[PDB]
Amino acid sequence: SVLKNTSVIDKIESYVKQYKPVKIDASKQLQVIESFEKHAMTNAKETESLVSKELKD
Amino acid sequence: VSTLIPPKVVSSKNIGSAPNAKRIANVVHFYKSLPQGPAPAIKANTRLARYKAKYFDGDNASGKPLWHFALGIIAFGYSMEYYFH
């Protein structure tokens, strides 16, 4: 209602309407992060076991 | 890009340098030993061992065994001198 001789509000409306799907989100943190984490818990359990037996000794 | 992992890397890291070196020394020094005064082995009587467990014991080891030995030596020497002189 503020603009009277807009001549552009339809164009920008359509441009935003066609722009909201910018691209597909990556969400693919499962190729090097997963391997790092797997190694993480594996040798972390190893270290927990060794420090535990060292404490008992 | 992974962060450092101190408590996750302890397999190769030991307690300084000297403590891990002396850990092996101290772990087995207290393992295979008598608990408290086991195996006194006080009993012994083989003339020499009889002296060991009778007068030559280290609990006192005073001059009394020495005086007794001197008395025996002079007693034998009296007869030896009677034979000779």
From Swiss-Prot, chain A:
Role noted for this protein: Mitochondrial membrane ATP synthase (F(1)F(0) ATP synthase or Complex V) produces ATP from ADP in the presence of a proton gradient across the membrane which is generated by electron transport complexes of the respiratory chain. F-type ATPases consist of two structural domains, F(1) - containing the extramembraneous catalytic core, and F(0) - containing the membrane proton channel, linked together by a central stalk and a peripheral stalk. During catalysis, ATP synthesis in the catalytic domain of F(1) is coupled via a rotary mechanism of the central stalk subunits to proton translocation.
Family, as annotated: Belongs to the ATPase d subunit family.
Gene name of the encoded protein: ATP7
Q: Which residues of the full protein are shown?
A: 61 to 117 of 174
Question: What else does UniProt say about it?
Answer: Present with 6820 molecules/cell in log phase SD medium.
| Source taxon at top rank | Eukaryota
Report which residue ranges the record marks as coiled coil: none
What's this protein's name? ATP synthase subunit d, mitochondrial
The organism encoding this protein is: Saccharomyces cerevisiae (strain ATCC 204508 / S288c)
Instruction: State the compartments where it is located.
Output: Mitochondrion; Mitochondrion inner membrane
UniProtKB/Swiss-Prot annotation, chain B:
> Which superkingdom is the protein from?
Eukaryota
Write out the annotated subcellular location: Mitochondrion; Mitochondrion inner membrane
Where are the bilayer-spanning segments? none
One GO BP annotation is: proton motive force-driven ATP synthesis
**Which GO cellular component term is one of those annotated?**
proton-transporting ATP synthase complex
Key words of the record:
ATP synthesis, CF(0), Hydrogen ion transport, Ion transport, Membrane, Mitochondrion, Mitochondrion inner membrane, Transit peptide, Transport
An additional note in the Swiss-Prot or TrEMBL entry is: Present with 14600 molecules/cell in log phase SD medium.
**Function, in words:** Mitochondrial membrane ATP synthase (F(1)F(0) ATP synthase or Complex V) produces ATP from ADP in the presence of a proton gradient across the membrane which is generated by electron transport complexes of the respiratory chain. F-type ATPases consist of two structural domains, F(1) - containing the extramembraneous catalytic core and F(0) - containing the membrane proton channel, linked together by a central stalk and a peripheral stalk. During catalysis, ATP synthesis in the catalytic domain of F(1) is coupled via a rotary mechanism of the central stalk subunits to proton translocation.
Family, similarity comment = Belongs to the ATPase F chain family.
Subunit and interaction comment:
F-type ATPases have 2 components, CF(1) - the catalytic core - and CF(0) - the membrane proton channel. In yeast, the dimeric form of ATP synthase consists of 17 polypeptides: alpha, beta, gamma, delta, epsilon, 4 (B), 5 (OSCP), 6 (A), 8, 9 (C), d, E (Tim11), f, g, h, i/j and k.
What protein does this entry describe?
A: ATP synthase subunit f, mitochondrial
Question: What is the originating organism of this protein?
Answer: Saccharomyces cerevisiae (strain ATCC 204508 / S288c) (Baker's yeast)
